[PDB]
Amino acid sequence: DEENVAARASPEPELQLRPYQMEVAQPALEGKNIIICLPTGSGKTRVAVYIAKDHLDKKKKASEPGKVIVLVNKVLLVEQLFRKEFQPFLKKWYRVIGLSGLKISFPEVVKSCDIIISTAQILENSLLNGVQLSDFSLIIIDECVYNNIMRHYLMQKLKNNRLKKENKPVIPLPQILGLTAS
Ligand code: NA
């Protein structure tokens, strides 16, 4: 019909999820740390991008810091998620970049961009050594390397419990979104 004719001439990618995908995303949309398990890579990716956009939109509305890092475990996945997914979906609203490993610096992409696609190793190197976990409001972990990052998170949670006891400000920690297909 008339609606269908128009839709057939509407080329921009769309980020409307199926109801099942919405159901499994819901706790992440509410800001809860969670794992999402989906049956396809394309589905997992679309859900990740939707959650990232929702997250950053809410932070902007609330005048709170918003910055997403997406961690993968292969250099080729960095360029894929950057150029084929997050950039085409969100470039209208957010500064997206992929960094895998020559002039571009990881600490500087963290300062200047809103969605950073990188490897777990690069984050871990920047952390275990320029960058802090608190810099990010959301960390998306593909195929949920990660033991050290997770220990680091948990230790900051423990440290925050001490800071609270001491009537000192806590250090902000990101929401964690783990993905697995499937
Ligand atoms: Na799916």
Task: Name, in order, each residue with C-beta under 8 angstroms of 29's C-beta and a sequence gap of 6 or more.
Answer: 51, 54
Query: Could you tell me the CA-to-CA distances from 116 to 19, 42, 46, 94, 140 in Å, in that order?
Result: 28, 19, 16, 10, 10
- The total number of structural domains in the chain stands at 1
Query: Could you tell me the CA-to-CA distances from 66 to 56, 75, 94 in Å, in that order?
Result: 5, 25, 10
Centre of ligand 1 from the C-alpha of residue 146, in Å = 24
Centre of ligand 1 from the C-alpha of residue 133, in Å = 29
Contact 25, 50 (CB under 8 A): yes
Centre of ligand 1 from the C-alpha of residue 142, in Å = 15
Distance of alpha carbon 166 from alpha carbon 182, whole angstroms: 43
**What are phi and psi for residue 11, nearest 5 degrees?**
-80, -20
Centre of ligand 1 from the C-alpha of residue 81, in Å = 16
Contact 94, 66 (CB under 8 A): no
**What are phi and psi for residue 163, nearest 5 degrees?**
-60, -40
Domain that holds residue 55: 1-182
Centre of ligand 1 from the C-alpha of residue 180, in Å = 11
CATH of the domain at 62: 3.40.50.300
Closest CA to 116 of 162, 161, 166, 66: 66
Final resolution, Å: 1.6
Centre of ligand 1 from the C-alpha of residue 158, in Å = 35
Closest CA to 140 of 90, 105, 103: 90
Centre of ligand 1 from the C-alpha of residue 181, in Å = 8
Centre of ligand 1 from the C-alpha of residue 40, in Å = 5
Distance of alpha carbon 78 from alpha carbon 94, whole angstroms: 17
Token digits for 66?
A: 């918003």
Q: What share of the chain is helix, strand, coil (3-state, %, to 5)?
A: 50, 15, 35
Q: For tokens 């360029």, name the residue.
A: 79
Q: Is 84 helix (H, G, I), strand (E, B) or coil?
A: helix
Centre of ligand 1 from the C-alpha of residue 43, in Å = 4
